[PDB]
Amino acid sequence: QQDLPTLFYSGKSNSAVPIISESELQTITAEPWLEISKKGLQLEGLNFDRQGQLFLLDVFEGNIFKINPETKEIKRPFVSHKANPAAIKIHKDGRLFVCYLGDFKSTGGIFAATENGDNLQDIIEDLSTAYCIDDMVFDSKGGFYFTDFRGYSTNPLGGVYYVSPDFRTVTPIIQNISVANGIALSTDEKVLWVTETTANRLHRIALEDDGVTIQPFGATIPYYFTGHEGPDSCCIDSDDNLYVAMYGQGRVLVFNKRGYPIGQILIPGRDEGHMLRSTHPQFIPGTNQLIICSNDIEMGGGSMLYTVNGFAKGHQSFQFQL
């Protein structure tokens, strides 16, 4: 957390229910942090381990990178054996859970492995299930919610599902979503955030204490995004703010706990069409420094990790609890 552009609780960003348009949002431009390659890689799945080391991957080739935020050294522990891996969520026991899309129609799933790619275990099989899992989030009990990345605008085949801590039970939380993409839990785990990419909508779901039942009229749409392509991955901070990467828009939008926009982070070169594939936001553990990955594949230009300081320190998600 150095002297990078920072988001402050000023003006409408400090209001509980600010009435404001995207063009007037407190805005900052992210700075280059670490180039992953001169080559165009579909970077995704940012996630730090208990040691504060950064893990991520590229969807198309399945490479898995481990980065030292301190020295900025890049390592390539292993490669996904499953097609189109999209996210990495680290378990409290140190394992890496990898969500993958497969053929984009039904051969997706989730597998776990060690930091080095050993002990490959199937959490959710690809052929026995019809899921194409794009992301997930662990609750404090070891269970997790994942997004079913399927369908399109008027064909809502997607949805959100909950997997029990023993990975034996899978129960649907909310369905009829045109490609569920990003997902996150509020600090108290009573609210579930989900982004619907092909319909440009943000979902806010109030859950009962059992964590699987939606409160009466608890599933709402606090925000309608705009622009091609749509909302992608997201994460929260300790103040319960939501950071949403906008795929194809070269930006990240930030909302407060009530779902109102309060911040905007732009990726350099977006106006000229560069680095529009901003796919994931993630905080360096114990700090308010946000890391954002994007790539310039669409114009032949490499893969970069950008950074800025968010409103508050990152949240102590599962891999940081004990």
Swiss-Prot record:
InterPro entries: 6-blade_b-propeller_TolB-like, SGL, SMP-30/CGR1_Lactonase
GO biological process entries: response to antibiotic
Cofactor note: Binds 2 Ca(2+) ions per subunit.
Sequence positions that bind Ca(2+) 1: 44, 134, 181, 232-233
Binding residues annotated for Ca(2+) 2, in chain numbering: 106, 108, 126, 129, 131
Keywords: Antibiotic resistance, Calcium, Cytoplasm, Hydrolase, Metal-binding
UniProt-annotated location(s): Cytoplasm
Major place of residence: cytoplasm
GO cellular component: cytoplasm
Active site positions, chain numbering: 232
Enzyme Commission number(s) of this protein: 3.1.1.-
Enzyme class of the recorded protein, top EC level: hydrolase
Cofactor(s) the protein requires to work: Ca(2+)
UniProt GO molecular function: hydrolase activity; metal ion binding
Induction cue: Induced by cell wall-affecting antibiotics such as oxacillin, vancomycin, fosfomycin, and bacitracin.
Function: Exhibits lactonase activity. Acts in cells with perturbed membrane integrity and is possibly related to the membrane homeostasis. Contributes to bacitracin resistance.
PANTHER family: LACTONASE DRP35, LIPOPROTEIN-RELATED
Family of this protein: Belongs to the SMP-30/CGR1 family.
Protein name per UniProt: Lactonase drp35
